[PDB]
């Protein structure tokens, strides 16, 4: 379900974009959010 408010999770990366379900979780990922990501993939 979905409330009419903000201030859900304020942890949000920016750099990527990813969200997390749990608290705390932003932290350990910027530790391992080193190099980029392109269009071009094996
Ligand atoms: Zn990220």
Do not use: D, M, N, W
């Amino acid at each position: 379900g979905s409330s009419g408010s903000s201030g859900e999770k304020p942890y949000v990366c920016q750099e990527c974009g990813k969200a997390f379900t749990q608290s705390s979780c932003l932290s350990i990922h910027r530790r391992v959010h080193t190099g980029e990501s392109g269009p071009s993939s094996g």
